Amino acid sequence: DSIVKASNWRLVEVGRVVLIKKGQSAGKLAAIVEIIDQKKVLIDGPKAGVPRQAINLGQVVLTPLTFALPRGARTATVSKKWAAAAVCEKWAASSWAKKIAQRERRAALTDFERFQVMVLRKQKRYTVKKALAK
Amino acid sequence: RQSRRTSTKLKEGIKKKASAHRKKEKK
Amino acid sequence: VEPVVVIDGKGHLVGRLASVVAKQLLNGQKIVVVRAEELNISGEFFRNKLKYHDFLRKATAFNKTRGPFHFRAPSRIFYKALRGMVSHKTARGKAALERLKVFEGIPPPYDKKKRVVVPQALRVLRLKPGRKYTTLGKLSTSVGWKYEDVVAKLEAKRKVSSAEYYAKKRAFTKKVASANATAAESDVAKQLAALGY
Amino acid sequence: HFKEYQVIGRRLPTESVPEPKLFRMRIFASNEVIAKSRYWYFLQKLHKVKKASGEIVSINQINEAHPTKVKNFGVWVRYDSRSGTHNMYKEIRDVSRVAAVETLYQDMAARHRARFRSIHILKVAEIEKTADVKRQYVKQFLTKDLKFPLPHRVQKSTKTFSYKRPSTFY
Amino acid sequence: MKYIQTEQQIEVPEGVTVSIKSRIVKVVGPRGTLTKNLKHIDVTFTKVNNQLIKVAVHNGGRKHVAALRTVKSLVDNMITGVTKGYKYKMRYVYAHFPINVNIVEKDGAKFIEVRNFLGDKKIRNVPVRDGVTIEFSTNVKDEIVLSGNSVEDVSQNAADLQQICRVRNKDIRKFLDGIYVSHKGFITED
Amino acid sequence: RSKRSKLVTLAQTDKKGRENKERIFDEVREALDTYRYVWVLHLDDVRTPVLQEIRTSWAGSKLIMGKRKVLQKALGEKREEEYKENLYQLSKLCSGVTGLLFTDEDVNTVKEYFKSYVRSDYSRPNTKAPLTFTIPEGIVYSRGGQIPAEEDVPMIHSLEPTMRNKFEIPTKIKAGKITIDSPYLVCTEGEKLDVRQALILKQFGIAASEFKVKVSAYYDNDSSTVESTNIN
RNA sequence: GGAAUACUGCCAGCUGGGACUGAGGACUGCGACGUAAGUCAAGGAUGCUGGCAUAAUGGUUAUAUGCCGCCCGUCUUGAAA
RNA sequence: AGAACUGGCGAUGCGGGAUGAACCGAACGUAGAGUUAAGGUGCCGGAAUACACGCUCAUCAGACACCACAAAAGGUGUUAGUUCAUCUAGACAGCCGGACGGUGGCCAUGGAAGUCGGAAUCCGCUAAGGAGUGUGUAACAACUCACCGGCCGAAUGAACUA
RNA sequence: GCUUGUGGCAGUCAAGCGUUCAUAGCGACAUUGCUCGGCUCUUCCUAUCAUACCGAAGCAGAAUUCGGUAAGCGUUGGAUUGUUCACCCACUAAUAGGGAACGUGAGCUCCCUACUGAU
RNA sequence: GCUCCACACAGAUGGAUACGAAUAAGGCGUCCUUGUGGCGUCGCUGAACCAUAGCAGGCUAGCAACGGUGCACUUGGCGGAAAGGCCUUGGGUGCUUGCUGGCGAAUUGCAAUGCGUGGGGAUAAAUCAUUUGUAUACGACUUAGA
């Protein structure tokens, strides 16, 4: 029985949702509307507020998220289908976006709020080291 | 093996070959 | 940061690696390079094997013995490489390659202690995928180094005796990742999360 | 970086010759003044004039009509080299008239060593229907549902010392 | 020209079943098994229907596009080698001295002796690669048969049987002596 | 760079191309009105002196050949694409070899002639041959051991290299004579032939294959009727 | 049809962070703010506070490191010699 | 080589060009602070192991400097162009089939049938077949591509330019 | 960045470049015409004379010629010297060409240090 | 070295936080049909992880756990590549910020981090001097002698 292993990938395709690293948009989800060439795609995510633009694929990262979108789809039309797939709910459900939040939320701890964390992590340890050596 | 340093007598004995190519074209 | 940054050649590019290993001593940074032999380079093999011998010939006239000594053993191969970008000769220099150390294999006391790599210098991550790229090991040998094996063999050993290790650890964790899991979800925890942790 | 400049010139109106012919040409440049300077150079190649003999009537920028659309651009180019000058045509799949001529100029440098002083851009035109596309590397994206990967992804690190040993899936 | 997506197709018959993890390729079938490493080449295998395999190559250069077609062939030859087998027939000729070819089981490694060839006291001992079997051609005078699964094992060992019989510093036309591959074929002819 | 550079030729013949296709296109369309009856032939494989014998049989009726797709488009492919009425129906039926014939003569004189016409020809690929050809275990001859040896000449030593490679037969040569150790058999009665099985019997000059030319569809111009008959 | 928004340019727009400097030595001057009295960021730093006499601090010499440094004079020749 | 002119050094430090009479900047009181020139920013070395588009594999690449000499060409290395031509009336490649009739044309001659040669290179048939592109033979045969045609189903070939 | 292998003169040449472009005229490889030195001891170079392995030849064998990789290892002796500015048979596997400048002319007609070793 | 006297005193500041191999692939978890096996899941930076509150970290009162951890001991085992460390068993003794307490901090005044010598004694050995010659310019080398 034939097993060809692995070969999984994220793909540049019309209607792949992307997360942009470098740029004014940054950390905001848009989706590929039209592949220009090898390196350039045309994006947009009107739900976040990032505008419709030519963009190098080095500016951006593809996500494990995709939806049904026609070729060369306009802003209103993108939004509709984006709302149809309801990606944000799907998106924020991933351990991926949860990490991005967990980076952000930690970054805005007060000095006092950070102290609390230490104090709790003192308790949470005691309960944990109890459970072991049994 | 050959070198890739230009000795200065050559590096400036190129300029004085290039100058001779300038006056040759005009005439 | 860390006082000793045991690196690890295993898939780096003699150059680059170097450079950085270099700067880092110059800026007072005790390094230590391991698995030298699994260092790499650029280009076919039958090259480095040149861009070398040539190097070999070199040597001194009237008195061959006093001159450009051609070390074989990897480690050193790569040394040079590096003692070549550090004004070696001058207090501040010597004061460096003072700070260095390049073993082939990965003998104690380093076996037992985390290592690391230097992005900004891995074959995988710099060489246009699929391109000729040499791998010391051979390249040493090919020109003297008499041990490739010892290393090798008296290697496999290490790897073993370790992985073994591993396990025992992988086994351990699991338990934790399990305790924490369960005794996770009770208040206290919750709270944390809010803050994030 | 580039912008497109609509320029008109008319060789200052002499006695008995009121309001001459007016020469319209679209010039891609980086600024209004490079544009003007280029304009006269092209004037000296079309006919016998000089920069002092004429006048820049009107120089106005042109923006791209729909820069959220992807067009295909069939470009005519005259360019000089080591040899005598020679006409050319390439194709560019792009967003904007201007980003097109831009990306062409990089290619004209990369392949043929020719710099901005040498290149005349003859005419840039959108091609509306497919099959008028004569180049393979353009036709290559004009297939229904083009789904491909970008394997071997370099993740650029800021820190010199990485502990993970970087894997490049995507 | 920098292609975008270059793929071939590998047709798999009903007997054999392919296994490909990383770039290591197993062909398990009627005659036995074949394994081959293809990491050196760097392509993408894709099972499509238990009956067709697509190797693709993205963003390829002409030299990387080439590397793709030769992979179809080198898996094809791994499949045909089990369902059909590879058999190479070698006939040997002479002028005066008849060549007295035999097989020795010395050290259990299996060698082929070449004796008396062009009047030689030098006995030319040739190794036999594993997988490949040797048998003498019955009812045909002075002929030997090399039959195995792999194309390498076979044809390389055929080559080592031929190259040992040069004529040193003599004429090509005048001296006919040696061993030559007469016929290239299959084990199961259909 | 790097491409197969074609064999440089200095032949006295030039490439026909489209100047020939146009000359055929008009010739079919001019012969449709002048003549009355049309036939389409499935002439499987045809020797040239056989074709000229069909030519020299009658000079009144015209034989038409060329490209199948030339013969579809000059006549007609569909109900819209047509020169004459119901002309597309005969073109859909002919799919094998291109053969076509215009005639002004009687229907019965044609079909009786072509059923009776069967000629001596070589064994052909993918077609069966009714012989069990065996070669003698000594010196081989030009006939291959069918006629007595005294009548026939021994085969040329120059052709034996080909006998080993394409014709496959295990051939050794002693004193300029082609010799096989065992009595070889190539073919049997009632078996489909391969290319090498065919060419062996072509080399020895054996005419053990019947050639009967067949005809299929039939048409009359003024009546516009399409007749289908399977002869052999 | 209706807004925007980039880009270019303006502000005698507002609000921060850092380094360097404090020349001069009664008052005159040009101003600003105030209804006036007066006050001020207006012809160049003032205010508060801390460190000491077994001081504070400052220097000398010997080396060390970084970086730089062809042997002085005369006489030629176009300078190096 | 000679003549004229205008600079540079000569009486001249300073940054740069790894190093230097002729090159690049910049003509100097002693300091602090800022900004730059020329040149650079993997490490030696102060400064992006910056971003962006391409190109290149070299058996001692390249970073060689009015692109000047060895340079006119060669290469089944590679990327792009330009100009001619075929292209679902089915091209390119490919196994398959035909590749003929006066005729085994005519002189040369033991022997010449396309194929050791000399001068013509005709005509008929057709879809197309050269009084012939090679292998081979004493001479023939058989094979051959060139020219068609069938089986397959799309872009391919030639001369060049960079 | 010096130099090495195929002469110069007239011409059927014949890709392109010549203000227009074969006739302002040049023009690549070809083909037509005439015709005061030389005896020791070190080192390196390959452009190899032998030895090593191949490739080609109507190369049967033996031997030969041409060519390729290779510098690992080898490369002789006698009569002539009015200015040595010539050569011949004797052997051997073969008796290759050169560089290291006034190479070893401070081996010929109580300045500094390389090196060999020693404490 | 042992013993007796006399003296002399290239840059730490929470933690180097242990698989191997691949990268046109991999971890990690689960079911086993034990496989190049399936299902699940992760990655897109260490921004993590583990430690982290007390006079530069004191002195005392309980509650709840039966754990965490420091220290000399003790049982057994591992590590030869440069092992020169890494684990474990048993008990003792501290500490516990897991929870709640009860006391002290000032005036430091508004910044200026807060293991060799020089003689003795006992005992191991080498050198010199002598002898031999396998060695030798001189050295050095080799021998022999309570």
Write a concise keyword list for the protein shown above.
part of a larger assembly; 6 chains; A: 134 residues; alpha+beta; SH3 type barrels; 7 strands; B: mainly alpha; RNA-binding; Nuclear GTP-binding protein NUG1 (chain B); ribonucleoprotein (chain D); Large ribosomal subunit protein eL20A (chain D)
Layout: helices, strands, pairs:
The structure is cut from a larger assembly and holds chains A (about 130 residues), B (about 25 residues), C (about 200 residues), D (about 170 residues), E (about 190 residues) and F (about 230 residues).
Chain D: E1 3-9, E2 25-29, H1 32-46, E3 56-62, E4 71-79, E5 86-94, H2 97-110, E6 120-126, H3 136-139, E7 148-149
Antiparallel strand pairs in D: 1-2, 1-3, 4-5, 4-6
Chain E: E1 5-7, E2 10-11, E3 17-21, E4 24-28, E5 33-37, E6 44-47, E7 52-58, H1 62-83, E8 86-93, E9 102-104, E10 111-113, E11 126-127, E12 133-136, E13 143-148, H2 151-163, E14 178-186
Antiparallel strand pairs in E: 1-7, 2-7, 3-4, 4-5, 6-7, 8-13, 8-14, 9-10, 10-11, 12-13
Chain F: H1 18-34, E1 37-42, H2 48-57, E2 62-64, H3 68-75, H4 88-93, E3 100-103, H5 107-116, E4 118-121, H6 160-165, E5 172-174, E6 177-179, H7 195-203, E7 209-212, E8 214-220, E9 226-228
Antiparallel strand pairs in F: 1-3, 1-8, 2-3, 4-7, 5-6, 8-9
The structure holds four RNA strands.
Q: How would you characterize this protein structure?
A:
The structure is cut from a larger assembly and holds chains A (134 residues), B (27 residues), C (197 residues), D (170 residues), E (190 residues) and F (232 residues). Chain A has 134 residues and is an alpha+beta fold. Chain A has helices at 75-85, 87-91, 95-107, 111-131; strands spanning 3-4, 11-12, 16-20, 29-35, 40-45, 50-56, 60-66. Chain A has a domain at 11-93: SH3 type barrels (Roll), CATH 2.30.30. Chain A is built from four helices and seven strands; from the N terminus they run E-E-E-E-E-E-E-H-H-H-H. The longest helix of chain A is centred in the C-terminal third of the chain and has 21 residues, at 111-131. Chain D is 19% helix and 27% strand. In chain D, the strands form two sheets. In chain D, strands 2-1-3 form a three-stranded antiparallel β-sheet. In chain D, strands 5-4-6 form a three-stranded antiparallel β-sheet. Chain D has helices spanning 32-46, 97-110, 136-139; strands at residues 3-9, 25-29, 56-62, 71-79, 86-94, 120-126, 148-149. The two termini of chain D are 32 Å apart. The longest helix of chain D has 15 residues, at 32-46. Chain D is α+β, with helices and mostly antiparallel strands and 170 residues long. Chain F has seven helices and nine strands; from the N terminus they run αβαβααβαβαββαβββ. The chains are: A alpha+beta (134), B mainly alpha (27), C mainly alpha (197), D alpha+beta (170), E alpha+beta (190), F alpha+beta (232). Chains in contact: A-C, A-D, A-E, C-D, D-E, E-F. Chain A binds chain D through residues 8-14, 34-37, 42, 44, 52-54, 57, 62, 72, 74-75, and chain D through 68-70, 93-96, 99, 141, 145-151, 169-170. Chain C binds four RNA strands through helix 1, helix 6 and helix 7. Chain A: GO terms for molecular function: RNA binding; structural constituent of ribosome. Chain A: It comes from Saccharomyces cerevisiae (strain ATCC 204508 / S288c) (Baker's yeast). Chain A: Pfam families: KOW, Ribosomal_L14e.
